[PDB]
Amino acid sequence: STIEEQAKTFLDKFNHEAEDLFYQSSLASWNYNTNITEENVQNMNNAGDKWSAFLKEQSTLAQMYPLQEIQNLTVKLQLQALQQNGSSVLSEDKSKRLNTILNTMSTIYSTGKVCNPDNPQECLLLEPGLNEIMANSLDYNERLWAWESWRSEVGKQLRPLYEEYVVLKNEMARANHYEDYGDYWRGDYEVNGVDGYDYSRGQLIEDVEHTFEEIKPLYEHLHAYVRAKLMNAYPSYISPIGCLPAHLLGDMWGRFWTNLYSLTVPFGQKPNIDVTDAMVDQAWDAQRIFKEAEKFFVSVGLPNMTQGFWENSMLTDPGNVQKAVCHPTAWDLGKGDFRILMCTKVTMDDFLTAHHEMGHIQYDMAYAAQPFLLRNGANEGFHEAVGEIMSLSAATPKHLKSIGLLSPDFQEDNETEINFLLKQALTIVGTLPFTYMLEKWRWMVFKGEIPKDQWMKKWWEMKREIVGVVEPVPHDETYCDPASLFHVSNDYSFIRYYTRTLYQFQFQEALCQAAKHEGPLHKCDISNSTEAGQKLFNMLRLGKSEPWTLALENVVGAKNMNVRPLLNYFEPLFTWLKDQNKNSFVGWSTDWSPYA
Amino acid sequence: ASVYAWNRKRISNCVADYSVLYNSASFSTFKCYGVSPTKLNDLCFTNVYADSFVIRGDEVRQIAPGQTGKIADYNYKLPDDFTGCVIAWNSNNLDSKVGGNYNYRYRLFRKSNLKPFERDISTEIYQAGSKPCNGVEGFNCYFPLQSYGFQPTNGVGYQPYRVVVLSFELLHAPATVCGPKKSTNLVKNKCVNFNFNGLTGTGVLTESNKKFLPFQQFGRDIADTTDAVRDPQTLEILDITPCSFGG
Numbered sequence: 133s134t135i136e137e138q139a140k141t142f143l144d145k146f147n148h149e150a151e152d153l154f155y156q157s158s159l160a161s162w163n164y165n166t167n168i169t170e171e172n173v174q175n176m177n178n179a180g181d182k183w184s185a186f187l188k189e190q191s192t193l194a195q196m197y198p199l200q201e202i203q204n205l206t207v208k209l210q211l212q213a214l215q216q217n218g219s220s221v222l223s224e225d226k227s228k229r230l231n232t233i234l235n236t237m238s239t240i241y242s243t244g245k246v247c248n249p250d251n252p253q254e255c256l257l258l259e260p261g262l263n264e265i266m267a268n269s270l271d272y273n274e275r276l277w278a279w280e281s282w283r284s285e286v287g288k289q290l291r292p293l294y295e296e297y298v299v300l301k302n303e304m305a306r307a308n309h310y311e312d313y314g315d316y317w318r319g320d321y322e323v324n325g326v327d328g329y330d331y332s333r334g335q336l337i338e339d340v341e342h343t344f345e346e347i348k349p350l351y352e353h354l355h356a357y358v359r360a361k362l363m364n365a366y367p368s369y370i371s372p373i374g375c376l377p378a379h380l381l382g383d384m385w386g387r388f389w390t391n392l393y394s395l396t397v398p399f400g401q402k403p404n405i406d407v408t409d410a411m412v413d414q415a416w417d418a419q420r421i422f423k424e425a426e427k428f429f430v431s432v433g434l435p436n437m438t439q440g441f442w443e444n445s446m447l448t449d450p451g452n453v454q455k456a457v458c459h460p461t462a463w464d465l466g467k468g469d470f471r472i473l474m475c476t477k478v479t480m481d482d483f484l485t486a487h488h489e490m491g492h493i494q495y496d497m498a499y500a501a502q503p504f505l506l507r508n509g510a511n512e513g514f515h516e517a518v519g520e521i522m523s524l525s526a527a528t529p530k531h532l533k534s535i536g537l538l539s540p541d542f543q544e545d546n547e548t549e550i551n552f553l554l555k556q557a558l559t560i561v562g563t564l565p566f567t568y569m570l571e572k573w574r575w576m577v578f579k580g581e582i583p584k585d586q587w588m589k590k591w592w593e594m595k596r597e598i599v600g601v602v603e604p605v606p607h608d609e610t611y612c613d614p615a616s617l618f619h620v621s622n623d624y625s626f627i628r629y630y631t632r633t634l635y636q637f638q639f640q641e642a643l644c645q646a647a648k649h650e651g652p653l654h655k656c657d658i659s660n661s662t663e664a665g666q667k668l669f670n671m672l673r674l675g676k677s678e679p680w681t682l683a684l685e686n687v688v689g690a691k692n693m694n695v696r697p698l699l700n701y702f703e704p705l706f707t708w709l710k711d712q713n714k715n716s717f718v719g720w721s722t723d724w725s726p727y728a
Numbered sequence: 729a730s731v732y733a734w735n736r737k738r739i740s741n742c743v744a745d746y747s748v749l750y751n752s753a754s755f756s757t758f759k760c761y762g763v764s765p766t767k768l769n770d771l772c773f774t775n776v777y778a779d780s781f782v783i784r785g786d787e788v789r790q791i792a793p794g795q796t797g798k799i800a801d802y803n804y805k806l807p808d809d810f811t812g813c814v815i816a817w818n819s820n821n822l823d824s825k826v827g828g829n830y831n832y833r834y835r836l837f838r839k840s841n842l843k844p845f846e847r848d849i850s851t852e853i854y855q856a857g858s859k860p861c862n863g864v865e866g867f868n869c870y871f872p873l874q875s876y877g878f879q880p881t882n883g884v885g886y887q888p889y890r891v892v893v894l895s896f897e898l899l900h901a902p903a904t905v906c907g908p909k910k911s912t913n914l915v916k917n918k919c920v921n922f923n924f925n926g927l928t929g930t931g932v933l934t935e936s937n938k939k940f941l942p943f944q945q946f947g948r949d950i951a952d953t954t955d956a957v958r959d960p961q962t963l964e965i966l967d968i969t970p971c972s973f974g975g
């Protein structure tokens with residue numbers, strides 16, 4: 133009666149009831165998200181604590197098992213999920229104080245209140261309106277005022293709150309034998325099993341920027357081009373030596389340059405690739421869109437969709453008193469239950485979103501054969517990257533023409549190719565610097581070697597080197613501008629978005645090579661190539677049973693992260709940028725400011 | 729019944745029609761290992777044994793010769809040389825409950841693998857470690873019996889399937905169950921060959937006026953040559969004459 137068999141029997145007892153309870157809870161959650169009503173609300177409680185009232189006890193009894201000698205790596209890894217102290221290591225007062233501070237910070241961040249002084253009785257929130265008006269306009273006064281007001285009424289009273297949150301999170305990190313909460317986050321990309329596949333938390337810190345510097349010549353070029361368009365859009369507001377302010381990026385944070393794409397259009401003569409008029413003319417309902425997505429998925433190589441999903445899952449227009457939130461989600465309710473939740477309509481964007489959600493469902497089924505504690509991806513980014521692969525391949529013009537979205541006699545050329553490529557890069561490679569700098573700043577703030585004074589101003593100079601942003605209004609210590617973001621107060625690791633883009637680029641590039649296609653990467657199509665889908669499913673079926681480094685070995689030949697697909701994809705854009713902004717000089721200056 | 733309490737039935741002394749069930753589309757799985765389903769109606773055994781229960785959909789492949797699994801080892805076991813057939817069909821519409829078909833249970837833990845054609849219904853608490861589980865479950869205690877979470881939405885694999893396995897025993901005692909025989913029509917005044925109730929021969933059949941006692945089946949005149957028969961259905965006496973021949 134060795135302890136290994138005792139642990140195996142404990143897992144066998146645990147997993148069945150855990151699956152049953154998780155299935156019940158997920159079914160209730162899906163019902164409430166499909167039936168917005170008070171009756172479905174209390175049910176959450178009736179399950180919620182119960183889940184904990186089942187999980188914590190199993191976590192309570194997952195300590196006397198000596199999880200240090202089990203030969204089966206799968207068994208030890210599965211048991212490691214239950215052998216987690218969590219936040220229970222802290223005292224009750226500390227835990228309740230942390231919970232209260234998280235609640236208040238999230239509520240105050242989500243309840244941003246800015247009233248225009250002319251009409252002080254009508255404030256505006258993060259919901260459309262002020263953000264919508266300032267994100268789509270051509271002005272410097274209103275945008276800057278809105279940015280300052282938002283950073284003032286969210287930053288003033290959250291600086292001590294975020295400080296206390298960070299220090300208590302770090303304290304509980306030491307409470308769980310972690311010298312830093314940054315290491316706690318990096319533990320997702322941490323494996324110490326098979327030799328040659330192990331990864332460490334410290335290595336990832338440098339590896340994140342090791343693949344980041346190579347896009348600096350490209351991204352800056354776009355910025356230079358943007359700056360060129362800035363000299364064609366903003367008269368005497370951005371110096372050619374310097375760069376643009378925060379509120380002129382199109383968003384209050386400047387994560388993406390989509391809001392600035394219209395200003396920086398490369399060639400507006402050629403219309404963009406749009407076939408939504410065809411689906412409206414051809415009467416493409418939600419059913420037709422889902423059927424075509426299913427057919428393309430089958431052509432790729434994934435197994436055909438099963439029944440039950442087409443009836444239980446909602447597809448379009450909650451409509452009447454039977455209301456439902458339809459934010460794009462793919463629900464893996466467990467026990468062989470997979471459903472979609474998204475308002476599908478007659479749009480190519482809705483087509484791509486449906487492709488994304490159903491690819492998420494397919495990936496969920498791919499590792500559904502894994503046990504309850506292994507039915508997840510190797511890391512956070514793999515799920516979203518896999519979901520986005522098919523959406524990327526479902527928008528290629530060749531794919532549209534094959535299923536007859538584009539005209540059968542359509543003819544694309546270099547002008548629309550360059551326009552589309554720049555449009556994609558303005559968001560894809562235009563967000564990597566901001567994501568990397570935010571992740572690094574969060575790494576320092578969790579590690580805490582920087583003092584509390586070195587929070588704002590350091591940020592506001594560091595953003596100069598990476599994102600290329602000047603200060604429209606000063607910020608010394610009286611706000612918390614970085615802390616006033618959605619993925620800063622909800623305890624969300626921000627490296628997932630950085631990793632997802634690189635993973636999806638690598639997978640798309642590898643599929644394009646091993647899919648029998650010729651030409652540029654942006655026009656690559658994986659339709660009717662079942663070998664590529666078979667290799668993709670070989671990757672997907674691993675789930676959590678294999679390390680992420682070992683997972684990154686079937687579709688792609690590199691277990692680590694590389695930047696080569698990023699440069700290869702935007703090759704025509706890079707060679708157009710090289711001879712486009714010849715008059716101006718690339719790079720920005722960190723000394724110039726709009727006020728000086 | 730339960731998988732570990734499989735319902736056992738003995739069938740003997742009747743005529744068994746197999747093609748009637750074989751020619752049915754309501755059975756999801758129909759696997760025969762002894763002989764072909766068509767040939768089954770020809771030969772016959774001395775008795776039949778039926779094991780009936782309902783299991784999970786994914787476990788149907790577990791019940792087979794040379795197959796192992798939790799059901800195949802701790803709930804019900806079959807030998808490698810099993811003779812007979814297995815018939816399974818979905819019971820999601822009936823057995824699975826909206827509130828959960830937790831009435832059904834399966835044996836998850838057992839000290840030893842079950843023997844072929846053997847049933848275990850023990851409810852003794854199982855022990856996985858050195859600590860003796862004295863009554864109430866402790867650390868190394870796990871219940872052998874686990875319920876079922878059948879729901880209307882559980883995927884095809886989790887739907888409960890009704891499974892019945894038929895085995896045939898042909899002990900040296902006289903056979904008691906056999907398939908239907910099928911009888912043709914009757915002709916007269918023509919040289920034909922016949923197999924009346926297993927008695928075969930050629931000749932021409934005519935109407936006669938002999939008076940059998942109520943228990944004879946045929947008759948012979950002398951030198952032991954059959955001359956008359958009684959048809960098993962109409963129960964009338966027919967006379968046999970050899971077909972004409974000569975030089």
Ligand SMILES: *[C@@H]1O[C@H](CO)[C@@H](O[C@@H]2O[C@H](CO)[C@@H](O)[C@H](O)[C@H]2NC(C)=O)[C@H](O)[C@H]1NC(C)=O
Nearest residue numbers: 426427430431434435436437438439440441442
């Ligand atoms: C998934 O695709 C396969 C391949 O077409 C489907 O299999 C056939 O589908 C057609 C039309 O959908 C039917 O007329 C055939 O009878 C199917 N044959 C078989 C052997 O299944 C399959 O039905 C599709 N899955 C679903 C749920 O529709």
Ligand SMILES: *[C@@H]1O[C@H](CO)[C@@H](O[C@@H]2O[C@H](CO)[C@@H](O)[C@H](O)[C@H]2NC(C)=O)[C@H](O)[C@H]1NC(C)=O
Nearest residue numbers: 910911912913914958959960961962963964965
């Ligand atoms: C075998 O079954 C047949 C079918 O019913 C029987 O034939 C009928 O028997 C009844 C009995 O009164 C008669 O009224 C009918 O006229 C018969 N039908 C015919 C001759 O075509 C037959 O008797 C049965 N054999 C038995 C009982 O030995």
Ligand SMILES: *[C@@H]1O[C@H](CO)[C@@H](O)[C@H](O)[C@H]1NC(C)=O
Nearest residue numbers: 163167168169170171172454
């Ligand atoms: C949604 O919930 C309300 C409130 O309990 C109930 O009256 C209604 O029947 C529900 N509808 C569905 C489709 O479940």
